[PDB]
């Protein structure tokens, strides 16, 4: 729902199991915990050199 | 993924806050919000609850 | 029902119509084995 | 007009001139076809409107296309049937098994602890009662497993049978094979596959009277006497059959099987107690009938051949405490009282079962007539004020009563 | 939600009504009573 | 328990008592507390509850308490129905304490369960139990095996104090507050259920033998027209 | 002008005596000592027996 | 036209009878309560 | 509308459960069967017990 | 669709044996094609969630349920279309609520 | 009672069954096989004999229903009742006769027993 | 003396069951697959359908003589006209027989 | 925990996560304050109180007035876990299973499929998932078993294919997680030293068999003497012969010895 709603934060329990998962969860090291995904700016589409590999004598 | 934080705490009890399409400013104010609150209690702000 | 007889359990009010009806249909149904007819129920759906 | 739905399974007032609808007298309602429908679809063999088209695929599928067989492969279906021997020892491991397996029940104290169900028992039993042609109580079988001796005897006697089985075969079977081979172009003694067999339905039905199910009981008795072939076997259980008829109240069988039991004295080894207790079953079902002279005939005749065993002597006593109070009140039974009082409780359940109550179960809601239910006006036995057997008039072929005013 | 029964303790009834002072109730208290004594002379 | 320390004998069941197995309540579902006054004329409803021990998520609360109101009304009581229901409950608990299927509430653990300076009986430990496991295990069912006749069974009007100006309707859910100052609100009343668990069999009594106003007109009533061999005056 | 009626005014009709002498009510009954059935004082059986002596 | 029936749908337990069960009716219920109680608190509390 | 409903019924063993008595008979059934002469209460005679003994 | 899966909706309506070929699978979309694993279930186990196999875990409660139902010490039976509206026969079903045997067939044929 | 209006059902009769020359030693607990045959008797009372008259009337009234006309008077009886809507009355195909030659022999043979 | 009776709410007020859109339970996915009623708490040992064709004659004895039903023999509408089934019967006719269609065979 | 699932419940039932509905939620019905539409407050444990025991019983609830099941007996559990393990590993396979442990000894896996190891695999997988939900029942009943089935606790585990821990092998290490983040809620009935409880359970079981086998025999032998006769009856022979032999058969087959 929009966020200026009271229907918006009227989930409190339930959304998330307590237990996670033993093959993808893990917990956060700290500031030098490079973390897959995580980038400053907004980016609907987080590719990389790898994913998307662009053809050009040097990266943009 | 579910869109939303959640917060467990001491006694057992757990608190989520949606945070679908939310700025990631708004998603650090619920997770202090989170540690702030003890979620133990919901009493009315009222001349007969302002003393415990 | 003999509580119920004495406290009014039910509609006080019955029928008026039908101890005349009744001898009509009677009537209708000799008419009916005279004419060589099948007799048929005189209530099919006003039940 | 129009004070509700459309369509015609709508509920409320409707009028011609504005929802004209064709006569539908009783079709099936919006969420099934109710029983009111159904009657109609079995007897009919149609919904009573006609415009519903008979669909009876899927019990057709359920009964012909199953039951089609052709008749090439019935000619070898016979020929390929599971090895009767084998087929019972199977299923007597298996029965032996789950008796074995069954948990002893544990005794509280302050109250009465429930039993745990027979479930894994069922099948195992099924299999050795279609087997054997023998059919066991699982009320006495639950009984006999709460016993604790009634549970050793039942697992002695079944191994016993176990092993006899599988170490000589099936006497019965053999017994019924010879006998149809004679027809076709004597009787051994009791053997001990069959003692054994007879020995645990006995305690069967032992556990069956402990709990309360007297004709479950007799039954189980009657279809283990099929399998006793001796004397002493028969005499015993002649006099088992005739104490749980007594039980059951079937005064009539009891009797007969308690002179059956005396008749085998002849016969029987000095020892047996069977003939005195026949004695005593015979005495017991005159008693009931209500036959007092009859009953101390009885059991003077059993006191004399046998001189005065407890059980005789005990029923004797009671003839004679029945005998000095009966000529105070009435000097005899009459004759048109005999068998008419309640005595036991187990007519009592079978009357509460199978009684006439008020309004149903009774000769005004619905007679029986050769297997086929009628209603209180056509009944062939009775011509009471009522009944359409008063309206049949002369038929034209004479004047048959003198009545003037009806018939 | 709390229900107030239509069948109540009636004037006319063989039950009859209370005092309030015998009742056994949340909202009554006996404990912290005083007695005092009023002249209406005058 | 998580943290395993390595990666860094025989066992046996004690007997049941609550501060020693709070944790074993606190996995258990439903919790019901047994008091006296349900032992009249009856065992019924003490057998039923018995009966749901084996399901393995239901516990039975009994106290010291409660067995010695037990004892005493089955020493003393004008009604023998009453005497000997009291006798079998105690031979059942006994049984079920044995075998360690229900758990016992000692004097000790009563003494460190009640708030200071309290007296208490049978009806107001009954109360105290249920307001410590509802203040501090607030997952479990309570429930109370009581009489329908109890005055114990609505304690905000008949086991409630004074006029106390120290307590609250929230005086049930503050950790610093004690046991029985949540008599005085009804959030006890709506946190712990009284339930009948299985009444024995509604059948009537043989009452053939009393006055029936319908029966009474055939006693000097004229039946010459209803026998036929056996008149009798 | 009637309007209708709540689940609370359907269940006032149970209230009352007339409601419960109907519908909610059992049988004094024994046991026929002759016929070894459920019985009620006063009605008997057909049978020669309970006609003569009609307990 | 707002009327808040997504929020006030969760408080028909708090009702009762025909207001419990029906939703039209609970939420006019609901709706009467919660505009009656605001009135209170501002002006007459 | 012919309507129907479906009927769910649950039998419990209860081995603690105690039946009431049904079986006194009025005054008038006792005298009027002590007039006809039956006894007023049910013959009862001891059966003896099962026994395997003779197999 | 690109990728069209065998569960999903495109000018179709939902069929349990056309979407659900086998039910213990699980098809999805690794590296544009239509892989197929054992679909499971997530159970608390020691803290955590564990995969169990789906199609035994439904398998081992259903059996478990039944079994449990099936040693229970009673029997029920489920009379459906019985020719009374539900209003009369919950009235008479009052009377006969709480009873033993005896007492509720005795009640039945005397009423 | 009665299952169509729950109206109570009463047997009348009269007291001096014994004294009486017809119905001497005749059982009512249930009625005779069919309703043209001779009532039940007790097996005390089976040497028993009736009037001649009343033997003889009642002889002709039951042979009225001997005969094939009376069979298609009870299989017309049965379409009737079943066109009017009576319920439980079974088709004029699955009917049977009341009487039979056999049924008729052995009823014949047990009167001559009951004399 | 008198037994407890109360008026139930689902006599008062029980609409339908929520339908399926495109047929399509949300949850299929995402619970398990039990038996109906296990889960709930519907259990039967023994299930009596009054509607079969061998309880009959049980059915019309608990019927009452007083109430009558017609058109036992005949029908009003004449039943030899043809006309299509129900849907969910020609649903399950095409379900079942699916060779029936052309070219069903497969070739070669 | 009351409504949702019990303490020996397999189901895995989240009460506050509706993934078995099949509607969105549109009445609450535990709610104590009308301040609860828009922020129910779920989570905190004296308004998740009032919200779960005001669920109807299901079929794991047993209501008050409706019997409840002996859950809680190992006649129960033991044969519980054998009809599991037969689920798991069908006849065919575990008869396929023995042969090649026969003959080869763990040296013949090559000759399954891939299928059926992947069976053997997620039969062991649910029968430690089950051992675990049935742990602190097995471990409260444990006083009052009886022999056949403190047997079965060895045959079932046998049957699935698990070597039971003593002090293939799947109850040897615990489950991968650190302990920050894992479920440590009260209430929730979790073991975490499986490998530590499961041991000393078969430790307690070897003990209650050797206890019961010596009081049976106690029990024979004051039985004979009673009767002054030596009359040992042969069903009861044969039962002695056969258990004696399945005993220390299926007790090495784990290894355990009994001492
Ligand atoms: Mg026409
Ligand atoms: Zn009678």
């Known amino acids: 729902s929009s966020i200026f709603s009271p229907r918006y934060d009227w989930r409190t329990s339930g959304v998330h199991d307590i237990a996670p998962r033993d093959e993808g969860d893990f917990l956060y090291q700290g500031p030098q915990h490079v973390l897959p995904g995580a980038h400053p700016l907004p980016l609907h589409h987080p590719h990389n050199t790898i994913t998307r590999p662009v053809i050009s004598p040097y990266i943009p | 993924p579910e869109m939303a934080i959640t917060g467990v705490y001491r006694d057992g009890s757990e608190r989520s806050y949606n945070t679908k399409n939310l700025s990631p400013m708004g998603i650090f104010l619920r997770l202090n919000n989170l540690v702030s609150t003890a979620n133990d209690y919901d009493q009315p702000f009222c001349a007969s609850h302002l003393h415990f | 029902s003999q509580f119920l007889k004495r406290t009014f359990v039910g509609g006080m009010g019955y029928n008026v119509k039908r101890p005349y009806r009744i001898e009509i249909r009677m009537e209708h149904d000799k008419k009916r084995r005279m004419r060589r007819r099948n007799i048929g129920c005189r209530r099919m759906m006003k039940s | ?159 016993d049978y176990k092993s006899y089985v599988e170490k000589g075969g099936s006497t019965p079977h053999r017994r019924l094979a010879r006998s149809r081979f004679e027809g076709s172009l004597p009787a051994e003694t009791t053997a001990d596959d069959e003692r054994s067999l007879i020995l645990l339905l006995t305690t069967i039905s032992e556990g069956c009277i402990n709990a309360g199910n007297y004709s479950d009981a007799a039954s189980v008795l009657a279809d283990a006497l099929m399998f006793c072939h001796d004397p002493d076997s028969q005499a015993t259980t002649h006099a088992n059959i005739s104490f749980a008829s007594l039980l059951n109240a079937d005064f009539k069988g009891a009797e007969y099987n308690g002179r059956e039991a005396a008749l085998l004295q002849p016969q029987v080894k000095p020892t047996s107690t069977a003939c005195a207790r026949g004695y005593v079953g015979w005495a017991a079902a005159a008693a009931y009938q209500d036959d007092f002279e009859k009953a101390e005939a009885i059991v003077k005749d059993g006191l004399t051949l046998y001189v005065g065993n407890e059980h005789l002597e005990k029923l004797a006593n009671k003839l004679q405490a029945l005998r000095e109070e009966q000529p105070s009140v009435y000097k005899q039974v009459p004759r048109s009282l005999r068998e008419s009082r309640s005595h036991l409780p187990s007519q009592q359940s079978r009357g509460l079962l199978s009684g006439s109550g008020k309004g149903f179960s009774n000769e005004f809601d619905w007679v029986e007539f050769k297997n086929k239910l009628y209603p209180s006006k056509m009944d062939p036995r009775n011509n009471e004020m009522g009944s359409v057997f008063r309206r049949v008039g002369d038929l034209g072929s004479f004047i048959s009563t003198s009545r003037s005013m009806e018939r | 939600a709390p229900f107030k029964s239509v069948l109540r303790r009636h004037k006319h009834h063989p039950e009859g009504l209370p005092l309030y002072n015998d009742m056994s109730k949340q909202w009554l208290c006996r404990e912290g009573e005083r007695w005092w004594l009023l002249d209406a002379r005058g | 328990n998580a943290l395993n320390p390595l990666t860094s004998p025989k066992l046996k069941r004690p007997l049941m008592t609550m501060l020693s197995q709070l944790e074993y309540l606190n996995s258990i579902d439903s919790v019901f507390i047994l008091h006296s006054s349900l032992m009249a004329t009856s065992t019924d409803q003490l057998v039923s509850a018995v009966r749901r021990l084996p399901s393995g998520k239901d516990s039975l609360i009994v106290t010291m308490s409660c067995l010695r109101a037990l004892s005493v009304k089955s020493l003393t ?129 043989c009452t053939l033998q009393y006055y029936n106003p319908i029966r009474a007109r055939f006693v000097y009533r004229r039946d010459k027209p209803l026998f036929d061999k056996y008149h009798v005056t | 002008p009637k309007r209708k009626k709540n689940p609370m005014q359907l269940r006032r009709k149970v209230y009352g005596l007339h409601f419960k002498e109907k519908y909610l009510k059992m049988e004094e009954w024994y046991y026929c000592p002759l016929c070894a059935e459920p019985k009620k004082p006063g009605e008997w059986c057909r049978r020669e027996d309970c006609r003569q002596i009609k307990p | 036209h707002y009327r808040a029936k997504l929020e006030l749908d969760r408080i028909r337990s708090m009702l009762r009878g025909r207001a419990r069960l029906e939703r039209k009716v609970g939420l006019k219920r609901l709706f009467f309560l919660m505009r009656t109680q605001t009135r209170y608190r501002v002006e007459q509390q | 509308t012919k309507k129907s409903s479906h009927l769910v019924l649950t039998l419990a063993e209860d081995p603690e459960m105690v039946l009431p008595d049904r079986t006194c008979l009025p005054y008038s059934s006792l005298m009027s069967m002590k007039r006809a002469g039956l006894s007023a209460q049910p013959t009862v005679i001891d059966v003896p017990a099962i026994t395997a003994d003779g197999i | 669709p690109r990728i069209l899966l065998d569960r999903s909706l495109w000018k179709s309506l939902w069929i349990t044996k056309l979407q659900l070929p086998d039910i213990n699978r699980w098809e999805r979309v690794v590296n544009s094609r239509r892989v197929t694993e054992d679909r499971y279930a997530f159970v608390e186990e020691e803290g955590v969630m564990h995969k169990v196999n789906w199609g035994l875990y439904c398998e081992r409660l259903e059996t478990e349920l039944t079994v449990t139902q099936e040693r229970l010490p009673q029997h029920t039976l489920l009379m459906k279309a019985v020719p009374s509206s539900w209003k009369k026969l919950d009235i008479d079903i009052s009377v006969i609520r709480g009873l033993s045997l005896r007492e509720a067939m005795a009640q039945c044929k005397l009423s | 009672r009665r299952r169509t209006d729950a109206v109570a059902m009463y047997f009348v009769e009269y007291k001096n069954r014994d004294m009486s020359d017809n119905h001497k030693g005749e059982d009512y607990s249930a009625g005779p096989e069919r309703f043209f045959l001779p009532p039940r008797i007790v097996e005390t009372e089976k040497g028993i004999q009736r009037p001649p008259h009343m033997q003889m009337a009642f002889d002709r009234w039951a042979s009225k229903f001997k005969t094939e006309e009376f069979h298609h008077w009870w299989r017309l009886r049965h379409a009737k009742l079943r066109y009017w809507g009576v319920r439980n009355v079974p088709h004029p195909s699955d009917v049977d006769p009341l009487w039979t030659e056999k049924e008729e022999e052995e009823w014949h043979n047990e009167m001559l027993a009951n004399t | 003396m008198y037994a407890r009776f109360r008026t139930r709410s689902k006599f008062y007020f029980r609409p339908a069951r929520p339908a399926l859109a495109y047929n399509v339970d949300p949850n299929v996915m995402r619970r398990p697959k039990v038996k109906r009623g296990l889960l709930k708490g519907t259990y039967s ?16 004895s608990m019927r009452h003589p007083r109430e009558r039903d017609f058109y036992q023999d005949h029908t009003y509408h004449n039943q030899w006209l043809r006309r299509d089934l129900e849907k969910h019967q020609k649903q399950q006719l095409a379900a079942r027989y699916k060779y029936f269609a052309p070219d069903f065979e497969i070739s070669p | 925990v009351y409504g949702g699932s019990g303490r020996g419940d397999l189901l895995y039932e989240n009460p506050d996560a509706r ?95 891939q299928y059926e190891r992947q069976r053997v695999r997620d039969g062991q997988n649910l029968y430690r998932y089950e051992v675990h939900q049935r742990l602190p029942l097995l471990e409260e009943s444990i006083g009052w078993a009886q022999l056949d089935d403190l047997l079965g606790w060895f045959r079932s585990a046998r049957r699935a294919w698990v070597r039971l821990p003593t002090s293939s092998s799947a109850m040897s290490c615990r489950l991968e997680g650190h302990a920050d983040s894992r479920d440590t809620t009260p209430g929730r009935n979790q073991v975490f030293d499986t490998p530590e409880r499961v041991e000393q359970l078969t430790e307690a079981t070897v003990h209650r068999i050797r206890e019961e086998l010596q009081r049976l025999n106690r029990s024979e032998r004051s039985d004979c003497e009673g009767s002054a006769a030596m009359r040992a009856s042969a069903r009861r022979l044969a039962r002695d012969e056969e258990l004696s032999r399945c005993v220390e058969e299926e007790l090495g087959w784990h290894g355990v010895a009994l001492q």
């Open chain 6, 77 to 205: 009581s004008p009604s023998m129905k009453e005497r000997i229901a009291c006798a079998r409950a105690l031979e059942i608990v006994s049984y079920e304490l044995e075998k360690g299927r229900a758990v016992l509430l000692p004097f000790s653990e009563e003494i460190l369960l009640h708030d200071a300076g309290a007296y208490c009986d049978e009806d107001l430990m009954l109360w105290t139990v249920a307001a410590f496991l509802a203040r501090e295990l607030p997952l479990v069912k309570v429930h109370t095996l009581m009489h329908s006749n109890c005055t114990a069974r609505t304690p905000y009007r008949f086991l409630k104090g004074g006029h106390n100006l120290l307590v609250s309707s929230r005086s049930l859910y503050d950790k610093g507050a004690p046991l029985l100052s949540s008599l005085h609100s009804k959030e006890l009343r709506l946190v712990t259920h009284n339930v009948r668990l299985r009444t024995p069999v509604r059948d009537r009594k």
């Open chain 12, 45 to 60: 040992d023994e299930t009596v359908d009054l509607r079969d064709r061998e309880r009959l004659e049980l059915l019309e």
């Open chain 13, 19 to 113: 993934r078995h509905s099949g509607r969105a939620l549109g009445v609450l019905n535990g709610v104590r304050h009308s301040s609860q539409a828009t922020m129910p407050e779920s989570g905190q444990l004296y308004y998740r109180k009032l919200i779960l025991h005001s669920r109807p019983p299901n079929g794991s609830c047993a209501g008050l007035q409706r019997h409840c099941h002996d859950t809680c007996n190992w006649s129960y559990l033991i044969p519980s876990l054998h009809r599991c393990a037969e689920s798991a590993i069908s006849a065919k396979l575990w008869e396929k299973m023995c042969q090649l442990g026969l003959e080869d000894r763990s040296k013949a896996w090559v000759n399954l499929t």
């Open chain 4, 1 to 159: 007009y129009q004070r509700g739905g459309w369509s015609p399974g709508s509920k409320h007032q409707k009028h011609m001139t504005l929802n004209p609808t064709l006569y539908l007298y009783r079709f099936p309602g919006p969420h099934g076809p109710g029983p009111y429908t159904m009657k109609y679809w079995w007897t009919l063999g149609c919904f009573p409107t006609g415009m519903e088209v008979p669909f009876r695929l899927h019990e057709f599928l359920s009964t012909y296309q199953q039951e089609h067989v052709p008749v090439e492969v019935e000619e070898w279906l016979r020929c390929y049937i599971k090895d009767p021997l084998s087929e019972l020892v199977n299923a007597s491991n298996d029965f032996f098994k789950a008796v074995e397996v069954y948990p002893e029940v544990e005794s509280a104290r302050g109250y009465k602890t429930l039993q745990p169900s027979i479930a894994p028992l069922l099948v195992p039993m099924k299999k050795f009662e279609e087997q054997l042609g023998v059919k066991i109580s699982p009320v006495g079988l639950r009984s006999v497993l709460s016993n604790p001796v009634l549970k050793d005897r039942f697992l002695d006697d079944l191994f």
